[PDB]
DNA sequence: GGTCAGATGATGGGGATGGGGGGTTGGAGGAATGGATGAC
């Protein structure tokens with residue numbers, strides 16, 4: 001089972017593109 | 032999902048839709064953790080109080096979907112179940128403690144742009160990411176409103192729904208409900224004064240509560256949509272199965288047999 | 291005078307499938323009754 005490449009989205013991470021509300025999560029991590 | 036928004040094509044490739052064969056009916060959500068493994072809430076498969084108790088050949092599993100019901104030709108893969116595994120200390124009598132189940136596919140599923148598994152978190156990722164105020168993301172084709180009561184606006188969405196929601200301190204969860212909480216669950220969603228809305232509703236169960244690590248840049252499944260009381264009610268918080276507190280059991284079944 | 295039963299009937303009509311005509315994917319063929327009409 002291909003579990004070494006999990007969590008990386010063919011249409012997002014694998015293309016260095018972000019989803020339209022992704023940063024919202026990252027910015028939550030600031031505190 | 033209440034107060035959500037329409038998913039972008041393939042922003043949750045691990046989103047798995049659990050489906051009843053006959054009569055054809057969407058039951059729950061699920062997440063793809065492997066090419067051969069799928070993770071859901073126990074209560075989608077076994078809830079005696081509602082005379083619910085399914086079998087491998089009762090259910091289908093549709094992967095890589097966007098549109099809620101229609102067959103998305105050349106995109107979605109439909110897999111059958113080889114074996115259903117429910118946590119043997121899942122407590123359906125009381126408070127859905129350990130609302131977790133694993134589902135083994137007969138064949139592995141070919142990955143694509145639309146199909147790709149999510150990571151389970153390790154000790155550190157859990158410690159690092161599961162903190163009050165940190166936002167995770169829920170997704171599903173569940174209800175847009177409480178449908179058991181008279182309301183207006185549609186009942187179910189026509190494409191996958193997404194909402195991001197902050198984890199909530201255990202003291203708050205504890206007393207937002209009169210249902211006994213557990214260490215095997217966490218609650219999430221905006222507080223009333225935070226002036227923002229959102230929740231998982233009925234039909235969203237088994238759906239992943241995922242978070243994205245700013246270190247390795249990977250998406251991790253932290254929770255499973257478990258339960259709630261109404262949808263998007265003020266002072267009410269969605270409750271999720273705590274994936275990491277149950278990883279020992281997950282790993283124990285996944286790796287039990289040589290693939 | 292009003293029950294009854296095949297019966298022919300446009301019309302709105304996929305398909306593991308909506309509204310369309312490409313999409314996150316081809317390229318065609320198309321659901322399932324309705325209410326007027328002799329036989330008594």
Ligand SMILES: *[C@@H]1O[C@H](CO)[C@@H](O[C@@H]2O[C@H](CO)[C@@H](O[C@@H]3O[C@H](CO[C@H]4O[C@H](CO)[C@@H](O)[C@H](O)[C@@H]4O[C@@H]4O[C@H](CO)[C@@H](O[C@@H]5O[C@H](CO[C@]6(C(=O)O)C[C@H](O)[C@@H](NC(C)=O)[C@H]([C@H](O)[C@H](O)CO)O6)[C@H](O)[C@H](O)[C@H]5O)[C@H](O)[C@H]4NC(C)=O)[C@@H](O)[C@H](O[C@H]4O[C@H](CO)[C@@H](O)[C@H](O)[C@@H]4O)[C@@H]3O)[C@H](O)[C@H]2NC(C)=O)[C@H](O)[C@H]1NC(C)=O
Nearest residue numbers: 076077078079080081082083084085086087089117123124
């Ligand atoms: C939700 O719904 C489900 C139903 O959908 C419901 O569960 C059902 O309801 C009852 C449970 O309370 C139960 O009833 C029983 O059934 C007894 C017979 O059951 C067997 O019948 C057929 C085959 O004959 C199967 O279709 C059944 O699944 C069942 O087979 C057994 O099931 C057990 C439990 O899951 C399995 O054990 C697992 O085995 C694993 C390893 O497996 C093997 C192995 O070694 O490789 C498999 C091998 O094939 C087998 N050897 C061979 C070649 O045969 C060996 C072998 O069994 C042993 O190893 C050697 O000793 O095992 C692991 O070990 C794993 O950990 C383990 O879980 C297994 O597949 C299989 N074998 C066994 C152990 O038999 C009836 O006898 C009984 O009637 C009455 O008889 C008694 C005696 O006279 C009497 O005293 C009493 O009054 C009894 O009532 C009764 O009708 C249903 O079977 C059950 N179905 C299922 C799917 O489990 C849930 O409760 C419900 N939930 C709720 C709460 O709503």
Ligand SMILES: *C[C@@](*)(O)[C@H](CCCNC(N)=[NH2+])NC(=O)[C@@H]1CCCN1C(=O)[C@H](N)Cc1ccccc1
Nearest residue numbers: 126231232233234235236257258259260261262269
């Ligand atoms: C199975 C899932 O689709 C569903 C999701 C509910 C999520 N709701 C919110 N607001 N996040 N779960 C349920 O409906 C579960 C299973 C049956 C009972 N239940 C509930 O959440 C009840 N509404 C409350 C409850 C009853 C009994 C035990 C625990 C909770």
Ligand code: NA
Nearest residue numbers: 263264265267
């Ligand atoms: Na709320």
Ligand code: NA
Nearest residue numbers: 104307308310
């Ligand atoms: Na089409």
